[PDB]
Amino acid sequence: GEELFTGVVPILVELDGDVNGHKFSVRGEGEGDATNGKLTLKFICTTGKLPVPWPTLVTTLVLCFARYPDHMKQHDFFKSAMPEGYVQERTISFKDDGYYKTRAEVKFEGDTLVNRIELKGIDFKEDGNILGHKLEYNHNSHNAYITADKQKNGIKSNFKIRHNVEDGSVQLADHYQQNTPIGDGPVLLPDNHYLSTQNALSKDPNEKRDHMVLLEFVTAAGIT
């Protein structure tokens, strides 16, 4: 399980979205290095103009690459479910605006770790902060507590992301998340802990499509 992640692992992300009837697709390629907790990917909107801000999709677009410290290998739900994979589902409720609902399969396909997502967004304001593209191109560092869901053989987490609005205000996005495995093998059920994440968003100088270059670090803590 956790042994498939010892080296660097190619990554493919594919997302089909639909927010208030505005449809779009994103494809992402890169690699993950779980021993450092490091993700580097370049995402393209393959359908043209992305109709939502790139930062509202960071959390949607592979926690099996977090760096779990050795005294916590026994709380690493995500790697334990590999290569069968796990389903990741979320509701992302933006305050005073609409909500995303996402369903993703995170699983090995060949030697590539693949993240295939379906997003539907509902009830957004057409000149709100999301559909009106009023968010800064960045993504604050944050902690998210994981707890186990014994009754479903998985884990659960709810946590708040605070997006910087370009006027100075902060757009809150309440995430409620649940993961459950795909196969039937043995899966670790962690104890209460948290994941600590940092994000760097950039652009490629030589890239003309709508796109996001992403460097992300995810590391586990909370268990002493």
Question: Phi/psi of residue 33, each to 5°?
Answer: -140, 90
SS3 of 79, please?
helix
Residues 147 and 141: beta-carbon distance below 8 Å: no
- Gaps in the chain following residue numbers (C to N > 2.5 A): 61
Of how many residues is the chain composed? 224
Q: Are strands 154-164 and 142-149 parallel, antiparallel or unpaired?
A: antiparallel
What technique determined this structure?
Answer: X-ray
For the chain, give every domain's residue range: 2-221
- CATH homologous superfamily of 2-221: Green fluorescent protein (2.40.155.10)
Cα 18 to Cα 40, 45, 51, 190, 221, distances in angstroms: 25, 13, 9, 34, 35
Q: Which of 174, 8, 15 is nearest to 105 (CA)?
A: 15
List the beta bridge partners of residue 176: 91, 158
SS3 of 221, please?
strand
Residues 53 and 130: beta-carbon distance below 8 Å: yes
